[PDB]
Chains A and B, each alone.
With several copies, the nearest count.
Chain A
Amino acid sequence: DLDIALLDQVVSTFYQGSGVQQKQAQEILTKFQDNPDAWQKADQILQFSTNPQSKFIALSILDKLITRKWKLLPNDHRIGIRNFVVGMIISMCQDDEVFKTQKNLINKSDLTLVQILKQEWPQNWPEFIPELIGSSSSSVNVCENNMIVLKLLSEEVFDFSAEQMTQAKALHLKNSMSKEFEQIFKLCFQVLEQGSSSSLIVATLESLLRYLHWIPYRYIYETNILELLSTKFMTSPDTRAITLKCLTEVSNLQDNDLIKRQTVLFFQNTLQQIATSVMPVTADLKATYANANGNDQSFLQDLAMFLTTYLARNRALLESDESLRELLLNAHQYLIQLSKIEERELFKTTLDYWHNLVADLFYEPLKKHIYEEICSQLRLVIIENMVRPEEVLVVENDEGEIVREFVKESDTIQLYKSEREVLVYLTHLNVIDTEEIMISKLARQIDGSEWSWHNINTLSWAIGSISGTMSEDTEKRFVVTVIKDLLDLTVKKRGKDNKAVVASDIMYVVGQYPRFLKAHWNFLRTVILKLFEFMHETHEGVQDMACDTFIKIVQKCKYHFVIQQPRESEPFIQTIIRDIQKTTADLQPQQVHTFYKACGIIISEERSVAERNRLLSDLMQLPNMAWDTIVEQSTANPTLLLDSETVKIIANIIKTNVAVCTSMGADFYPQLGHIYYNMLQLYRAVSSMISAQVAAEGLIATKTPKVRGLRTIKKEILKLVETYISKARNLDDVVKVLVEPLLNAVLEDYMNNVPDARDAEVLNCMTTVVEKVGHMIPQGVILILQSVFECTLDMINKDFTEYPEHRVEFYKLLKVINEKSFAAFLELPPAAFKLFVDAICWAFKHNNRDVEVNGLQIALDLVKNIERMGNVPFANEFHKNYFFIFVSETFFVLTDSDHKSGFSKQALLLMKLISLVYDNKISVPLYQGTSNQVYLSQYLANMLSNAFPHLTSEQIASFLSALTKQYKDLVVFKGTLRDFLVQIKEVGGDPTDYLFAED
């Protein structure tokens, strides 16, 4: 269809054009490259095209042919393609302009040759390596490119062969390269010591970097390549980084004093060479990194990787000899300088090592004196680089509400914890030095020499991280001093801006020292009351700080709020509850809810149940009065929920209940009961209004402010119920009182809602119910299935994309139903059990991990359930009806291109299914005295031959043979499956590959 000139035009349009025409050219190119017979256009393209991009694409088409259908080709074609690719590579190498400016095409060509080597070498090309080595002496460019070829070969065989090749083929190629590496190393070594050309030597070092991953130690330690690397190539600016990378891998390669002294030697040479030719230990790397000449940033990255890797493995080697003391401390001084570089990922690399060191010094304090200056330096470095321990996300939800929420397990948070751990160690190693550094840094905030918001915050985070380290008495003197200075600093600073910053840090520090707070009630009470005072401060961030600190402190110190302290006439929680209208008057709703949540934490600490309920009652007085009032108004006004102000008040009422229930859990029951029935009634009301309007106006009604206000009420109600039930201690009251009205209210409404009004949160609510009490409500589970299964399935069985949330929640619900209450399927008509099996297989076919995990898990659990029933009519009938359905469907997703995330579960499921037959657990023939074993093999062989006709009969037999012998060894069984996955994508696969485990 497309001749050469037109292809060149399409390529040029795609890469250099834009917009619609670029898009149109792409679709032409994609079709062209995917054409099975396109490879015959390839050599003509490679011969005649005036476009390097066209040639790149031609090589891709060639690669497809080589990796998939090489063995179909006559031996003439193979040699022809072979000679052509080799010839093409050589031409580009002798062409100096092309060699310099078309590296991507030459690399692509080299990779193509390596693909051929994977097919032909060495059994059909035994002289390749000798032919490669001698061709290197013909031209300096061919020699350089040969290093690239050898590099790619090593990568494809050792680095990326797993899952790309069968285990047998991979072993074959690894052993092949192992047998001929002797002469490869000779060429590599020779070039390294003789070589003039920078680009040649760099390329040689790049290849060696990959060899080091797998080559025998003797090539590294019984030659003198280590000495050559550590002396010659560090003085050179173009080879420094790549040499450090090689030595780093060497530092990851015993009872051997020779190898020990060589390990010491290359480190000694490298460090000496760096100090001599590159930079001294006193070099400001922080500034050097910041200017970033050429690739200096990468060199310093590679240096930190080298030092940390070596020292983590070989520090004890350098310590066992005092002549190496200078080398040891210089290495660590370099690390100190590197740790000052403003580059997080670089800093994290050093920190991982400092953690190793200071832990060792703690458990071996006799070595401590050696590193005293290093540690003192390190204390300051970490203190000055402490990151924030807490992060908050500000997001708009689906109802248009702006919501704060704390980040969990982020990189920043993990970094804080690592920094804290090191600082905790360092504090114990020398508490005086630690205290002196923090105090003097604080003094430099006071005198203004180092004053900034970032620096005072950073220091606060550092100080707040070492609680429980100094002993209680030293801690007391330390915190008193710190709070004193910070209080004076607040007075000293001009501007509400700066004052708020220091004040927030005062509050942060005290919140980090609960032992200090608990020991002194008057001070703790003073802290809380000032936080209350801050809740009236409109200055940005202050109220959030006050509320965050409040709940943080009560989390640690709750006990002191429920008991009656000395010189108090009542537990302070009573004081808090009474003034709650005044305290929270200026807060935003979300902040008020946090306040109530904090009170809930405290009230849960009351051991007397009568008094706990009384406290809860008093706490909820304001929202209950608002709720009671609105309940009364509901009787007097049928159009009550059309008032947006009323809707908003009701929303905040429920949110307040959710907040308190979150912290109180099981203790929240009496409050829940006070509103439960009216709340459920409210739910049906607002959900009806939503569904009615969505039906009349369509999907766009979901975005309207009115509907979103109603859906907020709807979702908060479900959230409240879910929150309590998940925390309930009394499951009887859940079942006997809560569940039945809940199911009637939400399941019926969900069922009668129009599809675009059904909330997936209902399914998630039901999942929580079933998880908690599903084993106690078999009839309730059935009602759930009757209400949500078919109507939800019909929403998600047209495509794989629509209603993404219902899809996830649907199969989460099905999983826990199948887990906790499988009895529900035993009572249901066959037509519905069929729908159940259909739904599972439908989840298999998703390119959606969140859906596919549960689909697999359900299938696994289902087979486990039925197998458990034993020799019983239901189990036996299931086997006749569905055994091969699951077998073939599992084999389908296994062999399909994009279901790799479920591979582990698929393999397990297949093992389990095979177990049912080859362990004779199925008491009944599966076919309409032939044993089930041989009918299974016949089914599979026929299934596989049909689906993959290019497979030989011996391939299939050998595969099924291995499978039915390995179904109890997961690791081996997986390996056999991966081998099969490799072989179904190519032609002429070796059937003896499946004997890999046995030999």
Chain B
Amino acid sequence: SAFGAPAFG
């Protein structure tokens, strides 16, 4: 979570 949650299309 340190980089932030990925937003996948």
Contact = CB atoms under 8 A, between A and B. Distances in A.
Interface of A: 740-741, 744, 747-748, 751, 782-783, 785-787, 789-790, 797-798, 828-829, 831-832, 835, 838, 841-842, 844-845, 885, 888-889, 891-893, 943, 946-947
B6 A747 contact: yes
B3 A785 contact: yes
A832 B8 contact: no
A439 to B, nearest CB: 70
Interface string B1-9: 011111111
The 7 closest A-B pairs by CB, nearest first: A892-B7, A786-B6, A797-B3, A832-B2, A832-B3, A786-B3, A831-B2
B9 A838 contact: no
A838 B8 contact: no
A888 B7 contact: yes
Contacts of B9: 740-741, 744
Contacts of A831: 2
A748 B8 contact: yes
B5 to A, nearest CB: 7
B4 to A, nearest CB: 6
Interface of B: 2-9
Nearest to A827: B4
Contacts of B6: 747-748, 751, 783, 786-787, 885, 888-889
A783 B2 contact: no
Contacts of A845: 7
A345 to B, nearest CB: 44
Contacts of A797: 3
17 contacts: A741-B9, A744-B9, A751-B6, A783-B6, A785-B3, A786-B3, A786-B4, A786-B5, A797-B3, A829-B3, A831-B2, A841-B7, A845-B7, A885-B6, A889-B7, A893-B7, A943-B8
A202 to B, nearest CB: 51
Contacts of B2: 790, 829, 831-832, 835
* Residue with the greatest number of chain A CB neighbours at <10 A, chosen from B2, B5, B9: B2
Contacts of A943: 8
B8 A829 contact: no
Contacts of A893: 7
B4 A829 contact: yes
* Residue with the greatest number of chain A CB neighbours at <10 A, chosen from B3, B4, B7, B8: B3
Nearest to B7: A892
A881 to B, nearest CB: 13
B3 A747 contact: no
A842 B8 contact: no
Nearest to A888: B8
A823 to B, nearest CB: 15
B3 to A, nearest CB: 4
Contacts of B8: 744, 747-748, 783, 888, 891-892, 943, 946-947
Contacts of A947: 8
A728 to B, nearest CB: 21
Given A748-B8, A786-B6, A841-B7, 4 more contacts: A782-B3, A783-B6, A786-B5, A889-B6
B4 A838 contact: yes
A846 to B, nearest CB: 12
A262 to B, nearest CB: 58
Contacts of A785: 3
B6 to A, nearest CB: 4
Contacts of B7: 783, 841, 844-845, 888-889, 892-893
Contacts of B4: 786, 828-829, 832, 838
